[PDB]
């Protein structure tokens, strides 16, 4: 499921600095001598929290190794409250590679291009059938212990 | 084929359709988006053939076009989808400078094969495409790839199968498009909109849509005889013998016959 | 079922970017002064080098 | 008598000339000259005679003659039962004060309380208000209302019907009484209306009667058709209807002016030609549009039910009630009679969701024959994806959709028949999908034991 | 030691017979397997039943392959309880479902020469079915001959 989600999110990666300057130079020389809204993976903790609260996010992927874990403990409950499907992924460095940064505490996808909307929908259903109900009973229970 | 017998069959069928549509429904409700003239107007008239043997040895998925004296699909309520092959933008601009009075109005969307396999790959998308338009036209260059792109949603039935249109002349997509020029492209599509469609199914029954119930019965009779004559010597194997029945038909009524048999074999018996 | 914020959406989220417009105009001014090199498609850079 | 006969100010004459009004009705001709003389007025006119100008001309003349300024607070207060009537009167007052430096504003339940508080603090000379919000602003917000010279109470029968009796009692108690001219209007005459006229007006009133005595409210010669449609498909059904019943005459009623404006822009983009009558246009534009619709072979006009309450409805094939009716008794009887027509019978269709079906039980109690209209699912023209793309990409249409959604929710909340039409039973996601939203925008649907040893207060001052 | 039957649904096109046997043979030994298929056209109904010898390995396979996103299909791997196992459920197990051309048989039977009296049965069937059709279209009114 992480492989499927990262296939979709690799389809919707943002642009690096080189591609952005290259594109801007292209528009500059085109003006010297028409577009739709860009669709990218949304990142940044405060930005993603604002997207979840306004019910704009469609799928939320939360890293599991945020060292100040307070920055993300309320995030599964927040996604549950506002109704956005979420999943916990292994590695903030993995989410970082996707957004061209060293790390990323959380990423979110809000809307996509037409040609893979169905795929996104299936992925959403996948996590809400493959991760959310396997977590549903153990999300409430205390963990750990040395009983035995 | 005796023509005034087909004519009185057209009177009988139209009278039965008019009487059935005017009958009130007994559930205590009335249809809101339907009217008697509209319910009659949306009702087609079918012509069914019962060849003694199989017309084709397999399922031919590309229809055959018969030119009619009085064409079909003439209402402005009908919306047409054009499926091209090379730059859909070229054909979008071609529509933008085509015939704005009728062709431009009828044509609702123009899509390429690449965007067809991209945006209409799932079954919901092609079901929505099926539900939106009612007359589909496709360039002969990519009509072979359509069974895969438009699957069982478009090709289990025959009513809205893509109609082949020639948009070629006598490759990088953006720099040129090998196509015939614009006014004959208009004629090719126009000719193709009003045309009887023959579908080479394996088994005997072959129903051809020929007209509606708002038509003059003489127009329907002319349509019947022209469909008979262009059907038998072009698509029926071993010509004017295999024919057994030509049933004219309403969708919810019985089949009125035009019976053409004295003999039911060939020489072998 | 509804968003928490009832604040209006700024018009900037429906119209093309203005920061990129300023950046592109700055690049246009730079090309006109000859300070920076114009756009060449990558196949031209490949066949040149 | 024409409007040029009275010695009005030149600003007021010019404004009425731009509206296009050169002749009066009976209520204007019989109320404006006594009210300009300073006499309190008791009226018996109904909605649509022209009572709005009849109480707005003396208020505008008083405000202009005493040279009111925004630092002087409210000079005249017009109390209306519902928010859409208040908005119609606000549009009329905006047209009337085109040349007047005086300010005008609306205070209605269901809007921003803090923005209305700032608006009242800055100074609103003519205040068109709703009783609950007017009482709330009079009690808890600091604004000047000490220079009040005119109190108009409009449609008092409906306000006493909704249950704003104690609210108006506290309103009349709070408001200043000395040198205040009171003008109260009601289409009926009950005991509560008499009580309100006794507490509000001075000992000497002037009782004016402009009312038809031959009201044909017979409960047998009628036939009301209805269609049961879920919320998320409602507009789609209407659109399909409005594309299938072309070459015909259709009148469509919406609950609010904002939704009429939104659906007008929406149908302009979705290539369905309509004509619009909402209270954000010039009165001249509205009269010309209604005249063009009245003398046409086909076409459809969309308007508010309270806006076409005072309208000479022509012969039409279809009268469609898309939104819940503001006055169900008036809707059924009078709108069904105007839908049936003088000639070959037109039909009156009502859009019902599968949560307001108790209205049918009401139609069972009134002994009104009903007709159920069903529709096939495959004949609905599905333009939902195009609608959502249009709402997501166009900023003006997004704003109009939000305003229409809020207006629909608030008008549904402030409904007389709260048992049949309850906002709490409404699915906001589906109705916002009907308006063209993926997610429903945020709206406010709403807008034991006593203490141990506590005896009632007998002294002290609380502010 | 009782066998464990496993119901696997939402099959992708490709995960049919030998791929199922191999992939779940990595999970443990399979006694039997059967994919339900259509009569008229040889084609899977996206549904299969696999019988393992060990019930615990069947539970393990069904648990860890249940909501598996394979080729755009989320699988349905549920263990059929021992009390609800139908007796002849694996009737066509470990057998190929051959694709048989029924319509080609019908066409070449239409070609096939009947000799002398089966054509008399042909015209007899033709005449009283024409008689019934004639009664039906004399109910509404349309005359025919020949």
Swiss-Prot record, chain C:
<comment type="function">
    <text>Component of the NOP7 complex, which is required for maturation of the 25S and 5.8S ribosomal RNAs and formation of the 60S ribosome.</text>
</comment>
<comment type="similarity">
    <text>Belongs to the WD repeat BOP1/ERB1 family.</text>
</comment>
<comment type="subunit">
    <text>Component of the NOP7 complex, composed of ERB1, NOP7 and YTM1. The complex is held together by ERB1, which interacts with NOP7 via its N-terminal domain and with YTM1 via a high-affinity interaction between the seven-bladed beta-propeller domains of the 2 proteins. The NOP7 complex associates with the 66S pre-ribosome.</text>
</comment>
<protein>
    <recommendedName>
        <fullName>Ribosome biogenesis protein ERB1</fullName>
    </recommendedName>
</protein>
């Amino acid at each position: 499921l992480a492989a499927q989600a990262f296939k979709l999110l690799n389809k919707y990666r943002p642009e690096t600095k080189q591609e952005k300057k290259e594109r801007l130079l292209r528009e500059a020389t085109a003006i010297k001598e028409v577009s739709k809204k860009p669709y990218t993976v949304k990142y940044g903790l405060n930005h993603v929290v604002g997207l979840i609260e306004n019910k704009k996010a469609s799928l939320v992927l939360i890293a599991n190794d945020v060292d100040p874990i307070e920055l993300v403990v309320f995030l599964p409950a927040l996604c549950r409250k506002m109704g956005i499907p979420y999943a916990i992924i292994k590695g903030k460095a993995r989410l970082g590679t996707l957004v061209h940064k060293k790390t990323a505490a959380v990423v979110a996808i809000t809307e996509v291009r037409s040609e893979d909307k169905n795929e996104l929908a299936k992925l959403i259903s996948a996590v809400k059938e493959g991760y959310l109900e396997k977590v549903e009973d153990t999300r409430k229970r205390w963990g750990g212990g040395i009983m035995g | 084929v005796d023509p005034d017998q087909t004519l009185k069959a057209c009177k009988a069928l139209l009278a039965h359709i008019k009487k059935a549509a005017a009958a009130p429904r007994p559930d205590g409700k009335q249809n809101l988006l339907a009217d008697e003239e509209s319910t009659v107007a949306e009702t087609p008239i079918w012509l069914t053939l019962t060849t003694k043997k199989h017309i084709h040895d397999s399922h031919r998925l590309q229809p055959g076009k018969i030119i009619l004296p009085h064409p079909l699909n003439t209402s402005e309520e009908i919306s047409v989808c054009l499926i091209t092959a090379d730059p859909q933008r070229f054909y979008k601009n071609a529509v933008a400078d085509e015939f704005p009075e009728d062709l431009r109005a009828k044509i609702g969307r123009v899509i390429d094969i690449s965007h067809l396999k991209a945006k209409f790959k799932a079954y919901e998308a092609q079901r929505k495409l099926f539900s939106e338009h009612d007359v589909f036209l496709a360039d002969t260059r990519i009509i072979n790839r359509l069974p895969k792109a438009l699957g069982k949603t478009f090709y289990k039935t025959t009513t809205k199968r893509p109609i082949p249109v020639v948009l070629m002349a006598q490759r990088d997509p953006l720099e040129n498009a090998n196509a015939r020029p614009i006014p004959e492209i208009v004629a090719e599509i126009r000719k193709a909109i009003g045309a009887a469609l023959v579908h080479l199914s394996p088994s005997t029954n072959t129903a051809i849509k020929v007209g509606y119930a708002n038509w003059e019965p003489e127009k329907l009779a002319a349509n019947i005889e022209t469909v008979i004559r262009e059907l038998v010597e072009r698509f029926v194997p071993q010509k004017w013998q295999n024919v057994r029945n030509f049933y004219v038909k309403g969708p919810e009524t019985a089949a009125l016959p035009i019976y053409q048999t004295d003999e039911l074999w060939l020489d072998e018996s | 079922k509804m968003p928490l914020s009832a604040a209006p959406e700024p018009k900037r989220r429906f119209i093309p970017s203005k920061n990129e417009a300023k950046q592109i105009m700055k690049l246009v001014r730079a090309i006109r002064e000859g300070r920076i090199l114009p756009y060449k498609p990558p196949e031209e850079r490949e066949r040149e080098e | 008598q024409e409007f040029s006969e009275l010695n009005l100010s030149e600003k007021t004459t010019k404004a009425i000339a731009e509206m296009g009004f050169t002749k009066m009705t009976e209520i204007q001709r019989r109320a404006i000259p006594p009210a300009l003389a300073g006499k309190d007025v008791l009226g018996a006119a109904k909605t649509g005679s022209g009572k709005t100008l009849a109480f707005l001309i003396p208020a505008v003349e008083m405000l202009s003659s005493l040279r009111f300024k925004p630092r002087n607070g409210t000079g005249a207060i017009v109390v209306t039962p519902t928010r859409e009537l208040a908005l119609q009167i606000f549009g009329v007052a905006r047209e009337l004060m085109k040349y007047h430096s005086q300010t005008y504003g609306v205070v209605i339940g269901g809007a921003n309380r803090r923005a209305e508080a700032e608006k009242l603090g800055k100074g609103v000379n003519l205040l068109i208000a709703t009783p609950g919000r007017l009482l709330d602003h009079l009690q808890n917000t600091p604004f000047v209302f000490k220079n009040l010279k005119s109190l108009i109470i409009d449609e008092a029968d409906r306000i006493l019907e909704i249950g704003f009796e104690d609210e108006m009692r506290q309103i009349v108690k709070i408001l200043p009484k000395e040198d205040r001219q009171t003008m109260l209007f009601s289409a009926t005459q009950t005991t509560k209306v008499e009580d309100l006229a006794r507490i509000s007006l001075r000992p000497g009133p002037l009782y004016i009667n402009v009312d038809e005595e031959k009201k044909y409210s017979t409960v047998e010669g009628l036939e009301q058709g209805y269609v049961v449609v879920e919320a998320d498909k409602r507009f789609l059904l209407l659109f399909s209807f409005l594309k299938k019943m072309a070459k015909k005459k259709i009148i469509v009623f919406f609950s609010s002016c904002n939704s009429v404006k939104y659906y007008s822009e929406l149908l302009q983009y979705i290539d369905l030609p309509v004509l619009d009558l909402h209270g954000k246009q010039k009165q001249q534009k509205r009269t010309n549009t209604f005249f063009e619709f009245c003398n046409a072979k086909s076409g459809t006009l969309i308007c508010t039910d309270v806006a076409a309450r005072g309208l000479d409805i022509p012969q039409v094939d279809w009268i469609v009630q898309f939104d819940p009716p503001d006055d169900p008794r008036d809707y059924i009887h009078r709108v069904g009679r105007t839908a049936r027509g003088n000639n070959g019978k037109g039909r009156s269709l009502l859009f019902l969701q599968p949560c307001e079906l108790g209205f049918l039980a009401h139609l069972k109690a009134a002994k009104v024959p009903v007709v159920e209209y069903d529709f096939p699912k495959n004949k609905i023209l599905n333009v939902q994806s195009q609608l959502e793309k249009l709402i997501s990409t166009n900023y003006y249409l997004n704003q109009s959709a939000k305003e229409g959604y809020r207006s629909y929710i608030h008008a549904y909340a402030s409904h007389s028949l709260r048992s049949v039409f309850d906002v709490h039973k409404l699915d906001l996601v589906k109705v916002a999908k009907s308006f063209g939203f993926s997610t429903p925008p945020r709206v406010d649907i709403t807008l034991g034991r006593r203490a141990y040893g506590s005896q009632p207060r007998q002294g002290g001052r609380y502010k | 030691s009782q066998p464990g039957v496993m119901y696997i649904a939402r099959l992708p096109h490709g995960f049919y017979e030998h791929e199922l046997r191999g992939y779940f043979s990595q999970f443990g030994e399979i006694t039997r397997l059967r994919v339900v298929r259509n009569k008229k056209t040889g084609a899977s109904r996206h549904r299969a039943f696999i019988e393992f010898a060990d019930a615990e390995v069947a539970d393990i396979a069904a648990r860890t392959m249940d909501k598996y996103l394979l080729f755009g299909h989320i699988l349905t791997c549920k263990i059929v309880p021992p009390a609800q196992v139908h007796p002849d459920l694996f009737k066509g197990a470990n057998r190929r479902f051959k694709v048989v051309p029924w319509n080609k048989m019908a066409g070449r039977q239409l070609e096939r020469p009947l000799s002398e009296s089966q054509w008399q049965v042909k015209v007899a069937k033709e005449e009283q079915r024409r008689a019934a059709r004639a009664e039906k279209l004399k109910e509404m009114g349309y005359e025919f001959e020949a």
